[PDB]
Amino acid sequence: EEDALQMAVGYFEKGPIKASQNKDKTLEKHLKTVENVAWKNGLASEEIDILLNIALSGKFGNAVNTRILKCMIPATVISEDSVVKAVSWLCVGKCSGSTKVLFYRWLVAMFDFIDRKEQINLLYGFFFASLQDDALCPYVCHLLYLLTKKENVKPFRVRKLLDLQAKMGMQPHLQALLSLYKFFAPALISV
């Protein structure tokens, strides 16, 4: 019924909350009791992380109330990350920065369960360019500390991290990312 319930939540998104005959938090809370048992199938996690977070109803409480428990039962798949990078699109809707903070915390917390981590690593710059905004730096730094491979240490990224360190503080998250970039091709040095 969850697949039916989540498509109902999508209908709850194709229309307003006011126009709905029933509350979202009632049906999404039945889904939440389900999450206390089993939160989101790979397809379910994908879709409910896709439509609930791109632009639609997805209240910065409601989208967060799900996002606290929107992780995966078996594993998170590539198509989950794909168009939530189009939630990382970060635009007119943007799933505004608080839900972005919980979203990047989602990825940091569940970086261990992806079938193909290489696919997200191939998406390295999409999150690396998200390091410039202040609110996601403490969490994007962790994510790229988890995503970093040698192919992602191009010298322009090294200079961008140095620019971030000079403009912003000596924050230990930037220091951790710098430690990785020193562990790889040493175009930068720091201890």
Added chain:
Amino acid sequence: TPLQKRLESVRKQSSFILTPPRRKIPQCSQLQEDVDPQKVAFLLHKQWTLYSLTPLYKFSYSNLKEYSRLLNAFIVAEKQKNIKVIFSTLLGMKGTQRDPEAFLVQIVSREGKVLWTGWFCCVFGDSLLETVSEDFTCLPLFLANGAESNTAIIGTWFQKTFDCYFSPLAINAFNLSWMAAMWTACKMDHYVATTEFLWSVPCSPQSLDISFAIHPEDAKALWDSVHKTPGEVTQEEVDLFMDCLYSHFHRHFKIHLSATRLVRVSTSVASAHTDGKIKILCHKYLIGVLAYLTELAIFQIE
């Protein structure tokens, strides 16, 4: 041959077979080829703190700019934990043609305030060249002079990139007396400084130090008293020079200087300490003083 030769060398050294090195009096070393007069003259009257430097793996005297950048970016990063690093081959600080050319490491701070001026030299050190493979460019001597903090940072960088290790070279009072004797045996003129021997008695509660500073010409005439075989100074001749000092000090102050230890032997050739801050190089005998110093660094490495 590639290692077993070094094992046989270690066997010979540990055997301790009749060591007394009858050494040639440091001959006037006319400055070989280039030896940048400004650079070498800047390198003479500087108090080098000696270290023993194991051979550098995968070193090349072509990639000086790359190492300069790699170390400059490391030193200023140790400040994160204004500075320029100029690796400079010296081109002439070598005893034989096959020795590796000595090269500098200077922490240049705006102007040329050389904070640290490191110095690796391998002169007359062919007891190490013929035992190490080609990949290692061996420079047994390392010369600090900058603060101990910067030395203990560039040494770490060198360990990290070259697998070379810096044991602080400590000249024992035996080697110190040897060099104090061959430097008053030299054929120099216009003695720059008095021949001072800073003794330091081994008293447990107190730490009295003695500066048995002799007039440099007066010590040369005292050396000629105990110098009989020319060309080479023996261990007995060195001991007799030192015992004439002993019998001129215990004669005067009734305290047996031979019961004390040398800590510093200033001479017109080159001052020399014990604890490491050793080699001031007053005169341009530095290819001979450095020859002795490298021969001593082999002793520590090998």
